[PDB]
Design a protein around this ligand. Structure first.
Ligand SMILES: NC(=O)c1ccc[n+]([C@@H]2O[C@H](COP(=O)([O-])OP(=O)(O)OC[C@H]3O[C@@H](n4cnc5c(N)ncnc54)[C@H](OP(=O)(O)O)[C@@H]3O)[C@@H](O)[C@H]2O)c1
Ligand SMILES: CC[C@H](c1ccc(O)cc1)[C@@H](CC)c1ccc(O)cc1
Length: 323
């Protein structure tokens, strides 16, 4: 990666881009819609792309990236691609198999970043959401420190450049950091973060340990009806964001994106609309003042759009602890 990019530096020396395009879809979409969106996102100037085994969009995004290489738009070296091991493959002996399957889907030699998607394990098998006859998920038990050693060996094997974690709390990060024989710290903790749920304490902690916070739900989430209470307020309808957008001559979404960049957060975003995808690149164009930043800090109301309620009975459920 060209050190010239709008990047930050991870604690293992590698460059990220601070703005990433997410490749989880709305549930009505054909997975193949990810190819079209990725090509557009490239053309608009995105070079960091967030995915997961579980989105089922990896083959499609990889194909988009390969055509943009074929036709001279990008090089592999200038793309930052993220995948995530899902809850069904957290067992140490299952982690590397899952990475190698993703690499086969993508026709890639390596991913740039590989995350534990949740600190919670589920029953192994091809089905991602194994449930019982009452419609409840079948939990499993894992040693997360041993999952982590397997993540480490994936990095030593050159299958991923970097490793870290997602949807971990303070205590779960601490478990990894204090682990005997620890070879590599996690480079990041990927978590939900916006105006409404600003993660100040989790963020402060991550920085003290050289861990980059990567934010999803930056624009209030895609509101996936399985996962998002449809009575939650719509973030972008917040009157404070509309009035600030008017002040800066920019949009509510652009205000929410910029707020996070100035806090040292790496931001993800998804849109289905080409014009919104170009619009979001305008985040590098303006500065929010120190006092407007404080005004946005004031929106914090502990509104969690994605509490992963179906996992609520799990011993390792991350969202009970204060942070
Ligand atoms: N690690 C995890 O657990 C996790 C969980 C959820 C998501 N993610 C990742 O985060 C990515 C982002 O997804 P998200 O669900 O969190 O959504 P988000 O980025 O908060 O986006 C929410 C909504 O913003 C709208 N939007 C985008 N640009 C806009 C603009 N300029 N003006 C007005 N509206 C705009 C989009 O609607 P339109 O399509 O109609 O424009 C979209 O539905 C995913 O693709 C995925 O990579 C990770
Ligand atoms: C992120 C979007 C996704 C999801 C992913 C991770 C989560 O912690 C919650 C929800 C939902 C459920 C799989 C989804 C839908 C379509 C898609 O292509 C990807 C993810």
């Amino acid at each position: 990666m060209n050190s010239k990019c709008h990047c930050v530096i991870l604690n293992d020396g590698n460059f990220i881009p601070v703005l990433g395009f997410g490749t989880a879809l709305p549930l009505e979409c054909p997975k193949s819609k990810a190819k079209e969106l990725t090509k557009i996102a490239i053309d608009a100037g995105f070079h960091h792309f967030d995915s997961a085994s579980v989105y089922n969009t990896e083959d499609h995004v990889g194909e988009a990236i390969r055509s943009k290489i074929a036709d001279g738009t990008v090089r592999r070296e200038d793309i930052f691609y993220t995948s995530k091991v899902w809850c069904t493959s957290l067992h140490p002996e299952l982690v590397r198999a899952s990475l190698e399957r993703s690499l086969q889907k993508l026709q890639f030699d390596y991913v740039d970043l590989y995350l534990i998607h949740y600190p919670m394990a589920l029953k192994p098998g091809e089905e991602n959401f194994p449930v019982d006859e009452h419609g409840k998920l079948i939990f499993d038990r894992v040693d997360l420190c041993a999952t982590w050693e397997a993540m480490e060996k994936c990095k030593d094997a050159g299958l991923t450049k970097s490793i870290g974690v997602s949807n971990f709390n303070y205590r779960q990060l601490e478990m990894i950091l204090n682990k005997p024989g620890l070879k590599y710290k996690p480079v990041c903790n990927q978590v939900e973060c916006h105006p409404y749920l600003n993660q100040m304490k989790l963020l402060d902690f991550c920085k003290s340990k050289d861990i980059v916070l990567v934010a999803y739900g930056v624009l209030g989430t895609q509101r996936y009806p399985p996962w998002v209470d449809q009575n939650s307020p719509v973030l972008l309808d917040e009157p404070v964001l509309g009035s600030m957008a008017k002040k800066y001559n920019r949009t509510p979404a652009l205000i929410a994106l910029r707020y996070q960049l100035q806090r040292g957060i790496v931001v993800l975003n998804t849109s289905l609309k080409e014009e919104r995808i170009k619009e979001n690149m305008q985040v590098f164009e303006f500065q929010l003042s120190s006092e407007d930043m404080k005004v946005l800090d004031g929106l914090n109301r502990n509104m969690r759009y994605i509490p992963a309620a179906i996992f609520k009975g799990h011993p390792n459920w991350p969202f009970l602890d204060e942070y």
